[PDB]
mmCIF file of C-alpha atoms in Angstrom:
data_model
loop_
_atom_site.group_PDB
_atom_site.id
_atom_site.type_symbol
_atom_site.label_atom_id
_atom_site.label_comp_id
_atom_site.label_asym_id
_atom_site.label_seq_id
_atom_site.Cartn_x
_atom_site.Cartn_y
_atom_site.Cartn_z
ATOM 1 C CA UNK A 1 57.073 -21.773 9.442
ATOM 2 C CA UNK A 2 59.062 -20.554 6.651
ATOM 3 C CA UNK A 3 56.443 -17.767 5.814
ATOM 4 C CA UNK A 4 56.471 -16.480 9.504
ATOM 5 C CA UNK A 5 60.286 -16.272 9.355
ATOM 6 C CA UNK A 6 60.288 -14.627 6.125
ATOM 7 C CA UNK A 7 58.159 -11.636 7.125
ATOM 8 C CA UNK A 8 58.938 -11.321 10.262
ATOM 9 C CA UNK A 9 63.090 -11.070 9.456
ATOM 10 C CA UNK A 10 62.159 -8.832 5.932
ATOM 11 C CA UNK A 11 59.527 -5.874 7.657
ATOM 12 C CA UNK A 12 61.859 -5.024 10.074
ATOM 13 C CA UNK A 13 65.111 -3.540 9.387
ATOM 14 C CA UNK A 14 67.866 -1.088 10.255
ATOM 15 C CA UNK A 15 65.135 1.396 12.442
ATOM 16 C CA UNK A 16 62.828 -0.484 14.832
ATOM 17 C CA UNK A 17 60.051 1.513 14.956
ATOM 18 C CA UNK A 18 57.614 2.560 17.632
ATOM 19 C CA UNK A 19 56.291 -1.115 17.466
ATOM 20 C CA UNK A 20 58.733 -3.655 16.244
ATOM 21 C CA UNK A 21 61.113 -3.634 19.524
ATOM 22 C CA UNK A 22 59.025 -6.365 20.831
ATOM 23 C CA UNK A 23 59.117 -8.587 17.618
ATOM 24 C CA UNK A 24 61.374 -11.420 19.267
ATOM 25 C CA UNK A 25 59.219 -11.404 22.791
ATOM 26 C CA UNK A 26 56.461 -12.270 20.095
ATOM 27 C CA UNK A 27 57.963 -14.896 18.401
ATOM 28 C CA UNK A 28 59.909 -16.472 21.437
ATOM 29 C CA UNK A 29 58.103 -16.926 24.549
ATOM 30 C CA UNK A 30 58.020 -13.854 27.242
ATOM 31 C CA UNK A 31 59.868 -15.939 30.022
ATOM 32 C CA UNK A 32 63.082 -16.932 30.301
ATOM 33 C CA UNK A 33 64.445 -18.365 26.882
ATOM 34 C CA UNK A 34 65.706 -21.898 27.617
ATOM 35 C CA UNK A 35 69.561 -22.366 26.160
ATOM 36 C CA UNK A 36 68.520 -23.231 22.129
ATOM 37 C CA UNK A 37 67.144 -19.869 21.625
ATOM 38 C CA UNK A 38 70.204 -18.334 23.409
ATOM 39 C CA UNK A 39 72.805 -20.151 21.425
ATOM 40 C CA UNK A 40 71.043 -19.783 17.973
ATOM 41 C CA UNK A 41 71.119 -15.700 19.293
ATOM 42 C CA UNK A 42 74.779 -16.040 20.277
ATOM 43 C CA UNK A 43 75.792 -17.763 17.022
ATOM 44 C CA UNK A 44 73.794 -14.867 14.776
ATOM 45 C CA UNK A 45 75.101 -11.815 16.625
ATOM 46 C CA UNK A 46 78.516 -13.487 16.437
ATOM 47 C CA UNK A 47 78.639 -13.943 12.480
ATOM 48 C CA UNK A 48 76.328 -10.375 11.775
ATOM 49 C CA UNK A 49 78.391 -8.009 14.489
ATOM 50 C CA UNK A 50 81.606 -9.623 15.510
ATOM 51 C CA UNK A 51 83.657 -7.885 12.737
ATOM 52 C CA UNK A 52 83.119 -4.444 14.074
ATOM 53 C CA UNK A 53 81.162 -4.607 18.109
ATOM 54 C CA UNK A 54 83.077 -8.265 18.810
ATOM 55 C CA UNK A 55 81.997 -11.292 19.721
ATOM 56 C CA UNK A 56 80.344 -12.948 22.496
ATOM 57 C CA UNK A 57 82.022 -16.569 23.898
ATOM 58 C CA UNK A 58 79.391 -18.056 26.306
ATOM 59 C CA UNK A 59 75.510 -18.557 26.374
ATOM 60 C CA UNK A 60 75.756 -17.530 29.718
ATOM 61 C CA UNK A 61 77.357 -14.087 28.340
ATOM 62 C CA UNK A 62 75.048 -14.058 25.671
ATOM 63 C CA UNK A 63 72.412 -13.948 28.751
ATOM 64 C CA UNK A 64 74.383 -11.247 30.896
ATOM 65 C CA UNK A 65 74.730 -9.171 27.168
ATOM 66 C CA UNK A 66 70.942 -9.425 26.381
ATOM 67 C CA UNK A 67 69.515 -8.461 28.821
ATOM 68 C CA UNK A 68 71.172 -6.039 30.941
ATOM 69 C CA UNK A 69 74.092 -4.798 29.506
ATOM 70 C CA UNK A 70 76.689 -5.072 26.732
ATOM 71 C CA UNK A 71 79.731 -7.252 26.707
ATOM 72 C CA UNK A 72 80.945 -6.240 23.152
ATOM 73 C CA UNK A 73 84.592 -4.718 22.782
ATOM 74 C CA UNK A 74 85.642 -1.801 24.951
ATOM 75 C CA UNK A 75 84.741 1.551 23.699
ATOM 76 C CA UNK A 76 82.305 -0.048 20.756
ATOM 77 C CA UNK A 77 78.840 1.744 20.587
ATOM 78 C CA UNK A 78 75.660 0.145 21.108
ATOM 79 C CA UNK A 79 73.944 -2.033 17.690
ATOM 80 C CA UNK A 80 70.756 -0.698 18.073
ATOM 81 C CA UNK A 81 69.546 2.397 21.061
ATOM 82 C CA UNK A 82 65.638 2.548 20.835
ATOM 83 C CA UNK A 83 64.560 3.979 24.320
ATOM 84 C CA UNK A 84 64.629 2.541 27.918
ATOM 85 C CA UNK A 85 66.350 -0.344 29.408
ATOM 86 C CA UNK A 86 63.127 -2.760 29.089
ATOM 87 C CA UNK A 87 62.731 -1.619 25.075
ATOM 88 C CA UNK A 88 66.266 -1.192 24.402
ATOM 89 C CA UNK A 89 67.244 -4.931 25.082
ATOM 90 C CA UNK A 90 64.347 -6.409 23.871
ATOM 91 C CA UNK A 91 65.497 -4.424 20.640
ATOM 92 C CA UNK A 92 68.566 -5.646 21.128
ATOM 93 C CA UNK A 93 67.395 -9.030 20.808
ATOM 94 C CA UNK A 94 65.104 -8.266 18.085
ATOM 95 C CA UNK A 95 67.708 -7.004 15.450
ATOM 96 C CA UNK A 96 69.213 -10.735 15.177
ATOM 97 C CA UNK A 97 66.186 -12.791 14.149
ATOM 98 C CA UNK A 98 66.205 -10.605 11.021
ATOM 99 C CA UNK A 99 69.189 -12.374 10.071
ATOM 100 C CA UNK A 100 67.104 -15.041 8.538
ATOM 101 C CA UNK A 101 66.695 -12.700 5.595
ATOM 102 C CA UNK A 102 70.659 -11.806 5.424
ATOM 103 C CA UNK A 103 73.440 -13.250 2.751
ATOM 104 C CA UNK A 104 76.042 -13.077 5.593
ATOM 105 C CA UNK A 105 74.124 -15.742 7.760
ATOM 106 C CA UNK A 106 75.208 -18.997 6.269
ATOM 107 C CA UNK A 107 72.051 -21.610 5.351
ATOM 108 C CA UNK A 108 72.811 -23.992 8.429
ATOM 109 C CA UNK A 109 71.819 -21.244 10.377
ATOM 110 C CA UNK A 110 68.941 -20.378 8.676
ATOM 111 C CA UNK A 111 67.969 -23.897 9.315
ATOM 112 C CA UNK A 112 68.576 -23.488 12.781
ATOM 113 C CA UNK A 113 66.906 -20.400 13.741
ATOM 114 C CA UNK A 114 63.723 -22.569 11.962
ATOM 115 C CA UNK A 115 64.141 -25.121 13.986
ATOM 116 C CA UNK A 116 64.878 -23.395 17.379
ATOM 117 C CA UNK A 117 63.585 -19.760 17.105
ATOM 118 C CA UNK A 118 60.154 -21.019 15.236
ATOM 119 C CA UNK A 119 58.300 -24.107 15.712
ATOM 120 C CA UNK A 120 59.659 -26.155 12.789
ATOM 121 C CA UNK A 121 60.965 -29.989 12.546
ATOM 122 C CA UNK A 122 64.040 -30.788 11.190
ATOM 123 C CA UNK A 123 63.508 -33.431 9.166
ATOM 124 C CA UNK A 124 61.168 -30.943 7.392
ATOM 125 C CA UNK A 125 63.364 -27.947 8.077
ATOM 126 C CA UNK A 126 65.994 -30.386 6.164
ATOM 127 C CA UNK A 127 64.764 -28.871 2.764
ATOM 128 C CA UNK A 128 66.309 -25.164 2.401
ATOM 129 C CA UNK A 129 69.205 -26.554 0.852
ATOM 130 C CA UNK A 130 69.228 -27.350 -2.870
ATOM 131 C CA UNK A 131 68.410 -30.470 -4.550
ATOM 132 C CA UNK A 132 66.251 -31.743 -6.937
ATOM 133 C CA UNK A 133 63.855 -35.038 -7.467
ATOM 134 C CA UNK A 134 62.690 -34.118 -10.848
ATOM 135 C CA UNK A 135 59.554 -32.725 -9.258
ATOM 136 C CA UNK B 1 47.065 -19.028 3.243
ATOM 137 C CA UNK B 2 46.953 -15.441 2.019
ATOM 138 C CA UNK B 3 50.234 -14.166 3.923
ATOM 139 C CA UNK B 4 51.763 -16.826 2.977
ATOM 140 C CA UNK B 5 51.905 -16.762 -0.743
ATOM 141 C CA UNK B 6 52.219 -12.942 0.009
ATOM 142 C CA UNK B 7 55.197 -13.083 1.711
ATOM 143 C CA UNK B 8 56.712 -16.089 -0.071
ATOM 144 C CA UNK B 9 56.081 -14.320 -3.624
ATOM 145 C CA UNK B 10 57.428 -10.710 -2.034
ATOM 146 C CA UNK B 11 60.816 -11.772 -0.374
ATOM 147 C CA UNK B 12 62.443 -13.439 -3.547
ATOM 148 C CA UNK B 13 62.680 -11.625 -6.686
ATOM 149 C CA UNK B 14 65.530 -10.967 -9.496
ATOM 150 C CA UNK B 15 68.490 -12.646 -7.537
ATOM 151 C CA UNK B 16 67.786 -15.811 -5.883
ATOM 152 C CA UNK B 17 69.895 -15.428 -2.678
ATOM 153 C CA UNK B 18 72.021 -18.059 -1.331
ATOM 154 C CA UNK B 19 69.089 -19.484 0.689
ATOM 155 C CA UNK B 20 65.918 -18.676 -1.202
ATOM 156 C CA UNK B 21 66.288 -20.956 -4.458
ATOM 157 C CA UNK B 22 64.773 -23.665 -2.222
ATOM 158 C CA UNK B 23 61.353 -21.978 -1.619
ATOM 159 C CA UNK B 24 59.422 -24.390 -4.095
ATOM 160 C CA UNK B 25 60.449 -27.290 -2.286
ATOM 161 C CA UNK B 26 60.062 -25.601 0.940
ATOM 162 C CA UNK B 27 56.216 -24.395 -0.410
ATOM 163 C CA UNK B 28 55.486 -27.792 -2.722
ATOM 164 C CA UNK B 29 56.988 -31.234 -1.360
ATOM 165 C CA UNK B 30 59.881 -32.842 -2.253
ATOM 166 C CA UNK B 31 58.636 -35.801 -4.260
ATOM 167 C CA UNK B 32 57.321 -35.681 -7.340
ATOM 168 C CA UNK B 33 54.782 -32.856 -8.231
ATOM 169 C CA UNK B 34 51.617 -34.556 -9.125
ATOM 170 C CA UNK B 35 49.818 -32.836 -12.350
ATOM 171 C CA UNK B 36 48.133 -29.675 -10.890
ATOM 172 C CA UNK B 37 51.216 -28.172 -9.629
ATOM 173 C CA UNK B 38 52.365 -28.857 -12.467
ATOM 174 C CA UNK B 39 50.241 -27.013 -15.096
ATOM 175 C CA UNK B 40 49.790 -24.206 -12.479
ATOM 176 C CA UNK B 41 53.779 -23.326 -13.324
ATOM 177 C CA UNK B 42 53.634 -24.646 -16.974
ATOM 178 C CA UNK B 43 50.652 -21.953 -17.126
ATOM 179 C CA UNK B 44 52.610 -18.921 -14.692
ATOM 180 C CA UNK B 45 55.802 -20.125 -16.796
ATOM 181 C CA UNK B 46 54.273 -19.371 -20.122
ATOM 182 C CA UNK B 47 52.089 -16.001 -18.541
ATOM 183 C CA UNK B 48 55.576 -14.783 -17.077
ATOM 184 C CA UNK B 49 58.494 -15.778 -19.937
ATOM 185 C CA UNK B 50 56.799 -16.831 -23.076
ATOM 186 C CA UNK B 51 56.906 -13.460 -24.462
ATOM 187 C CA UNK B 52 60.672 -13.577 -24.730
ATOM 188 C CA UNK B 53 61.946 -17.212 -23.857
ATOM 189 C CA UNK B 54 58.927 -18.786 -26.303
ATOM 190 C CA UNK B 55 56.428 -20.926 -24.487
ATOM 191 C CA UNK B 56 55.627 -24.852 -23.386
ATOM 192 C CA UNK B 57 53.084 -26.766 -24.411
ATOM 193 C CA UNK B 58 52.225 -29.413 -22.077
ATOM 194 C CA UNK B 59 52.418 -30.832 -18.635
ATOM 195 C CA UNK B 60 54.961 -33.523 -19.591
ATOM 196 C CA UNK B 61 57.566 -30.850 -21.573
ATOM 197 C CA UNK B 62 57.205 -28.632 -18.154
ATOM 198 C CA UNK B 63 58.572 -31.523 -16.272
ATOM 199 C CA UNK B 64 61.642 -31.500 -18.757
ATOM 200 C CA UNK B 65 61.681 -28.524 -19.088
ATOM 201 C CA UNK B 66 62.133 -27.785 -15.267
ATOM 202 C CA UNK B 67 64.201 -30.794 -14.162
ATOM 203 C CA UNK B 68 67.076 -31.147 -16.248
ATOM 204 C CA UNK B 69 67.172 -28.533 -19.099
ATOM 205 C CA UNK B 70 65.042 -26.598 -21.353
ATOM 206 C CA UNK B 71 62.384 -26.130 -23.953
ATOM 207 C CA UNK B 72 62.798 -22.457 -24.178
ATOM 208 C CA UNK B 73 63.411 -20.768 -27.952
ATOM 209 C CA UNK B 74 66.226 -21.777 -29.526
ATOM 210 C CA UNK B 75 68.957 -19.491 -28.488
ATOM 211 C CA UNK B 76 67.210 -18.028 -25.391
ATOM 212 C CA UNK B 77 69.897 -17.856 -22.478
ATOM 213 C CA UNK B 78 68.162 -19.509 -18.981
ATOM 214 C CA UNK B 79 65.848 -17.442 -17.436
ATOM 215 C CA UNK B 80 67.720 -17.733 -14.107
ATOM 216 C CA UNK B 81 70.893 -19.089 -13.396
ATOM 217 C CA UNK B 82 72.292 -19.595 -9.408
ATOM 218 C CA UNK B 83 74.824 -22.726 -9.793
ATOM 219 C CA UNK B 84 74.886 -26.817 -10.287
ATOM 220 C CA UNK B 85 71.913 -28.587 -11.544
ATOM 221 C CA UNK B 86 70.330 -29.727 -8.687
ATOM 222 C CA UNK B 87 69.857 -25.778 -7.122
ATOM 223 C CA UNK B 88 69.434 -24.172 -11.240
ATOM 224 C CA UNK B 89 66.530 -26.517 -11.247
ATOM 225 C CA UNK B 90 65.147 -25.121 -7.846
ATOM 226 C CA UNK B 91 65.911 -21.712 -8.579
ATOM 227 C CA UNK B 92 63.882 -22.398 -12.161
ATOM 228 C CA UNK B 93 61.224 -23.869 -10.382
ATOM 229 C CA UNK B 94 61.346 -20.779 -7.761
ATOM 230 C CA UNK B 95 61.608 -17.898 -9.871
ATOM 231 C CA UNK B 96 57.440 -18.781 -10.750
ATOM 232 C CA UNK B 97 55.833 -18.597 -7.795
ATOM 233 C CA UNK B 98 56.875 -14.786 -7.123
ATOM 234 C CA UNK B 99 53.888 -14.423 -10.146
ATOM 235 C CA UNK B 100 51.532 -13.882 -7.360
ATOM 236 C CA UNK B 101 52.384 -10.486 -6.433
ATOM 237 C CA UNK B 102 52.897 -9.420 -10.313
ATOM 238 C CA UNK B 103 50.843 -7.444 -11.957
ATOM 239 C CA UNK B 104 50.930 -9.525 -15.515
ATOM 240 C CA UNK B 105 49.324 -12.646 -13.742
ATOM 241 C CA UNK B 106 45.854 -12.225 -13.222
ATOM 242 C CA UNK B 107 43.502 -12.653 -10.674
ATOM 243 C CA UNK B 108 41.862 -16.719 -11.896
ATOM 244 C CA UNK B 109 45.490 -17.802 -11.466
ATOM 245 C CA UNK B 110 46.254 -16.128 -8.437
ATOM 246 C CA UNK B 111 43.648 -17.878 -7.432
ATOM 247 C CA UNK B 112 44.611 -21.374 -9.126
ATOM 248 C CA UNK B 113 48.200 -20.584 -7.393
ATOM 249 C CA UNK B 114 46.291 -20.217 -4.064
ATOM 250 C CA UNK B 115 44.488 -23.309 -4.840
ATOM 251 C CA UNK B 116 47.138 -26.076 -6.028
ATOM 252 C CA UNK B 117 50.128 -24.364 -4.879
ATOM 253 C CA UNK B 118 49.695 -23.413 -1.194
ATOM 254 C CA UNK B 119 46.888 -25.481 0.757
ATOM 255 C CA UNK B 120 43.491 -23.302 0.213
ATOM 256 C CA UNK B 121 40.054 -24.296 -0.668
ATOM 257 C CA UNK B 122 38.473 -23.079 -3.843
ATOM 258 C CA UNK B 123 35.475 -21.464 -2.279
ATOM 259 C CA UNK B 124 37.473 -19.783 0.285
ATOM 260 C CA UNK B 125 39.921 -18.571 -2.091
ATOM 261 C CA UNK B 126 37.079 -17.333 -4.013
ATOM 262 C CA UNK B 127 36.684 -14.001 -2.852
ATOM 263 C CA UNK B 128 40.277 -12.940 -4.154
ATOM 264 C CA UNK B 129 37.931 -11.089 -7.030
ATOM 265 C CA UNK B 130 35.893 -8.099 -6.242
ATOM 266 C CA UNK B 131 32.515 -7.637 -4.471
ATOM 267 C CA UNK B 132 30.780 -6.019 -1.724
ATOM 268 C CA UNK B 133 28.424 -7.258 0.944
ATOM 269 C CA UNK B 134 27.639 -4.082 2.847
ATOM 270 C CA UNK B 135 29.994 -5.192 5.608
ATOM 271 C CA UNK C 1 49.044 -13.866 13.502
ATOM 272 C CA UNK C 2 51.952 -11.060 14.023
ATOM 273 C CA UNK C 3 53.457 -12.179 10.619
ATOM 274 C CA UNK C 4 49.966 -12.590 8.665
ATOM 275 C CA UNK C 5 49.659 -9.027 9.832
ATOM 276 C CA UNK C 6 53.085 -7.733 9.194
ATOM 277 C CA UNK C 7 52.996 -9.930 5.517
ATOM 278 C CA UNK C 8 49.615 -8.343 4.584
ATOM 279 C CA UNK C 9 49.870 -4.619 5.234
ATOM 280 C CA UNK C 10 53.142 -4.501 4.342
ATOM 281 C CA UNK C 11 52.585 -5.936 0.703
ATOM 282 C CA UNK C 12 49.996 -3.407 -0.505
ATOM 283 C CA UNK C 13 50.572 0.144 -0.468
ATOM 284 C CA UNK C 14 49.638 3.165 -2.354
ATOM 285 C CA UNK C 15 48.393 1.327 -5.551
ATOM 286 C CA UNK C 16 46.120 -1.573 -4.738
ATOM 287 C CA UNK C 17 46.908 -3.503 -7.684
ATOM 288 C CA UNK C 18 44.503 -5.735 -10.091
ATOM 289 C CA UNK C 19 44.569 -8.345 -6.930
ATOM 290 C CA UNK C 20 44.678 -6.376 -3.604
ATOM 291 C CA UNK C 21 41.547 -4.684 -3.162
ATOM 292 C CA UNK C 22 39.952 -7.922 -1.863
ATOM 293 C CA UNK C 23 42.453 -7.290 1.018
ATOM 294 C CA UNK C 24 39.848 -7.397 3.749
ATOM 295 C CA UNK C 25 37.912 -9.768 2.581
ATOM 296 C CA UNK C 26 40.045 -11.908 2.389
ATOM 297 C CA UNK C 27 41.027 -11.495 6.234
ATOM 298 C CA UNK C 28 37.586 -10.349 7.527
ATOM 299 C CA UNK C 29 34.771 -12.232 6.237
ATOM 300 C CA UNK C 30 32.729 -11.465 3.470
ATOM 301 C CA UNK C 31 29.331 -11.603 4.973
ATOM 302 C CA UNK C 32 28.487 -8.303 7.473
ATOM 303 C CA UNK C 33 31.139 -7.480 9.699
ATOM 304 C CA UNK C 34 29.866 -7.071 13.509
ATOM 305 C CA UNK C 35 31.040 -3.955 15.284
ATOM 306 C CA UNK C 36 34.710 -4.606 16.694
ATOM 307 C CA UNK C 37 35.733 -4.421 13.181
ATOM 308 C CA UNK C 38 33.882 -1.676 12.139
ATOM 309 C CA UNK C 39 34.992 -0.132 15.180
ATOM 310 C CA UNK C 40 38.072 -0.427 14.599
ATOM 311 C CA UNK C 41 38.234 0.350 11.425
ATOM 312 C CA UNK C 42 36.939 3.773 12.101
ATOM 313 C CA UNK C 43 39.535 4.732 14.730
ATOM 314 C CA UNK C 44 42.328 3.056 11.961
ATOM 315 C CA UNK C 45 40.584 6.158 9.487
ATOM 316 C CA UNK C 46 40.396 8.220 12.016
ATOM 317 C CA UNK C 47 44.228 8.279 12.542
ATOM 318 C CA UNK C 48 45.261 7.346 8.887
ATOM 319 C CA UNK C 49 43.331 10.168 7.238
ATOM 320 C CA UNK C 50 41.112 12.265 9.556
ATOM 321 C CA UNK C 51 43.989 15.130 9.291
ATOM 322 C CA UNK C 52 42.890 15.734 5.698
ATOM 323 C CA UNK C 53 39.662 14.049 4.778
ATOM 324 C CA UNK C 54 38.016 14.648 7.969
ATOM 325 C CA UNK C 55 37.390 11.600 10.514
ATOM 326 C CA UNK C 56 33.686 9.778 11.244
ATOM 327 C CA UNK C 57 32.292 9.867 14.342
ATOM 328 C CA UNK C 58 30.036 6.746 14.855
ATOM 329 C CA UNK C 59 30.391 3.324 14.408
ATOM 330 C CA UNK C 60 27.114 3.707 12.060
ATOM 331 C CA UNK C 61 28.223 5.820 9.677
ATOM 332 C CA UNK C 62 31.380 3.967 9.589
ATOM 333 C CA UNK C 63 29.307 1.712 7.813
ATOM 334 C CA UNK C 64 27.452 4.211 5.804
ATOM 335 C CA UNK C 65 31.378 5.350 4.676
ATOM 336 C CA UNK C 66 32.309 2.128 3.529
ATOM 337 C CA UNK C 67 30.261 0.401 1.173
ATOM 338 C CA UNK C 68 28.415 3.303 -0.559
ATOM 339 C CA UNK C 69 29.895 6.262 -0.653
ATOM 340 C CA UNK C 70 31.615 8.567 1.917
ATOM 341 C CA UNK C 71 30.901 10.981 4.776
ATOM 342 C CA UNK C 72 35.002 12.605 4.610
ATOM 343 C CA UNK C 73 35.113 16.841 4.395
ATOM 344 C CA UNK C 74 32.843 18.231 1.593
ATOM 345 C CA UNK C 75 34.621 19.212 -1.134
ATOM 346 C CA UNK C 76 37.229 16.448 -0.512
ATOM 347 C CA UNK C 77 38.242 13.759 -3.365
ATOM 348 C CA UNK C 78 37.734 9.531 -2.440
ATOM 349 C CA UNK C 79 41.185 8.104 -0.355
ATOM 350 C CA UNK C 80 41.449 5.627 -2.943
ATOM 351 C CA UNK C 81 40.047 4.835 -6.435
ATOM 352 C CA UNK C 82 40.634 1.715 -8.166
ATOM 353 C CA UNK C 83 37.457 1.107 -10.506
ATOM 354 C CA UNK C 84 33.757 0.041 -10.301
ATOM 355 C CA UNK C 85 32.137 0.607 -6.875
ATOM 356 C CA UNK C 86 32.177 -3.283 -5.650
ATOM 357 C CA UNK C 87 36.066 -2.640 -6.105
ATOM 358 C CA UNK C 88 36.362 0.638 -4.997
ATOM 359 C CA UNK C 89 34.605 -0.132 -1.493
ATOM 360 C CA UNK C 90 36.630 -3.309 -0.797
ATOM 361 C CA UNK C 91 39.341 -1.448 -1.972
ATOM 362 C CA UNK C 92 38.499 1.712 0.520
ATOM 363 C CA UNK C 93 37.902 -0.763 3.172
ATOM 364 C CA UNK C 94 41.657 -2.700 2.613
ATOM 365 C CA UNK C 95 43.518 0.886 2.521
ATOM 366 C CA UNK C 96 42.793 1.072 6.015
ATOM 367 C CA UNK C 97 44.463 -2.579 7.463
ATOM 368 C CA UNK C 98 47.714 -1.251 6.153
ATOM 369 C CA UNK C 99 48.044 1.176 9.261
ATOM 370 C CA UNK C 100 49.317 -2.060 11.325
ATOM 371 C CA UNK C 101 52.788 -1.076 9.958
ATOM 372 C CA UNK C 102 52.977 2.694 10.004
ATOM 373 C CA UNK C 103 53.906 4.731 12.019
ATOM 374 C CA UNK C 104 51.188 6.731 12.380
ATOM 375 C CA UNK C 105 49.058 4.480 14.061
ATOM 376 C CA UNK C 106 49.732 3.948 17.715
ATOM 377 C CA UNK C 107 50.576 -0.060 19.719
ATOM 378 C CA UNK C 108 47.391 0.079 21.247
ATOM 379 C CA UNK C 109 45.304 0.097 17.931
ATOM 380 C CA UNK C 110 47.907 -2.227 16.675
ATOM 381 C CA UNK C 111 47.190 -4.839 19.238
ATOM 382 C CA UNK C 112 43.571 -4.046 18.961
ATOM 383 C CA UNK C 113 44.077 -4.621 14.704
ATOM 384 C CA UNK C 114 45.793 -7.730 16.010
ATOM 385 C CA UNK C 115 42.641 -8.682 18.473
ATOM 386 C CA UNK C 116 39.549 -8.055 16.206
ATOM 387 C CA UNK C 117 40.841 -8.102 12.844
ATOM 388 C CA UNK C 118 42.877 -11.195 12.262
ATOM 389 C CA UNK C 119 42.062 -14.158 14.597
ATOM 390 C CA UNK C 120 44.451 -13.299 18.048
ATOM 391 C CA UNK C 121 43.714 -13.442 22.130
ATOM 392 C CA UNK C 122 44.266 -10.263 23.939
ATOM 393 C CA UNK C 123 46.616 -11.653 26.752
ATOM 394 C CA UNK C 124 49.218 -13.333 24.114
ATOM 395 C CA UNK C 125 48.889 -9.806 22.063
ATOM 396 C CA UNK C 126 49.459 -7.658 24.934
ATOM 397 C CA UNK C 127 53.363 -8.583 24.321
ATOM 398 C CA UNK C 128 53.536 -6.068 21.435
ATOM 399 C CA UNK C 129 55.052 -3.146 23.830
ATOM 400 C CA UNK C 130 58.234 -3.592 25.506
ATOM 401 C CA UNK C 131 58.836 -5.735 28.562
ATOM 402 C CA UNK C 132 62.088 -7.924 29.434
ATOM 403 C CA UNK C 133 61.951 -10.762 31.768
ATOM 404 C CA UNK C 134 65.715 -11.403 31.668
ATOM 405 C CA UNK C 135 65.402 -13.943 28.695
#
């Protein structure tokens, strides 16, 4: 849903507090996320943190960088430290869904985190770009 | 819903970002807005922007007025301008339905908003007004 | 819903404007609210204001608190005033659902705002602390 997407990428932001770590485990499933999810996740930490942490080539290494570990360029501090391993990479993977609410991620993507990160259809997703049928 | 006008009238204001001049055909269809949609802007248009950019008077002048041009006061620069026609129009059509978290629209059309604009039922959407049942 | 949460006590804050106050019921009912609610709106007061207003210590007089008057220190002045006293309850009762997104209140009450307030199943809100299953 659009609304869903716009709340949940404009509360948090920039400090994940005591309770918004676990903001993506919410929206996505808790499992194992499938390869959509990943390369939606790889594609918007690629255009929001390349220029300064790298980028990431593979949605395998987007896997071995979530969860675990790090993968960004040598010597390049972590995005976002919030506690423990378990909290810190679920933060980790919660500061990129707030990129629906960003002017650096392009509207294609917005579109596709709807369609992949949310439940949303594309043909109805289709209709965050402009145009006009004298409505 | 509720959260959903809140959200979708909190997230866009002043500066209609790359990706949020869409959010009245992402909220409304993408046909042709039938007559109470219609009157519901024509009457948050005129609450909102008839003070300086003059008023409309009916349901039919809103629809030219939102589509293609104007209808404003003679002289008036737009009230919001973003790029080509076919987004100005969106963004002209957007830039209303942030009245429902204003404090210049009142309650009865927050409630009218609720009613035509997002999908609510009129005595659900009643109790937007005061009143206390000892709960 | 994590985002109707997130959308509605983030929105309102520290002025409950012409068209907030009605808040909670809005989300709750508007007939009596049972005892989950009540209960958990007294540990949300509790928390959110017991440190200068003094907290209330039964579910009871929770109730007593709300809709008429108050039961806070002697001496001390009303959490919030807005106007008449079918506003000024509602709008006493909505101050409190804002403590899903502060930082005052705990995850535990949040998941419990999340179970008994708005319309959500304990095990699929139990993902609101951290956790990583390798996603």
């Amino acid at each position: 849903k659009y609304a869903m997407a716009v709340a949940i990428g404009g509360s948090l932001g920039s400090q994940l507090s005591e309770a918004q770590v676990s903001a993506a485990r919410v929206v996505l499933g808790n499992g194992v996320w499938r390869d959509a999810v990943i390369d939606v996740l790889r594609k918007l930490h690629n255009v929001m943190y390349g220029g300064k942490y790298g980028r990431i080539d593979d949605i395998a290494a987007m896997r071995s960088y979530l969860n675990d570990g790090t993968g960004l360029l040598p010597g390049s501090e972590p995005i976002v430290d919030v506690g423990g391993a378990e909290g810190n990479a679920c933060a980790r993977a919660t500061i990129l869904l707030r990129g629906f609410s960003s002017t650096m991620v392009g509207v294609d993507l917005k579109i596709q985190m709807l369609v992949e990160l949310y439940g949303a259809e594309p043909a109805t997703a289709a209709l965050l770009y402009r145009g006009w049928t004298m409505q």
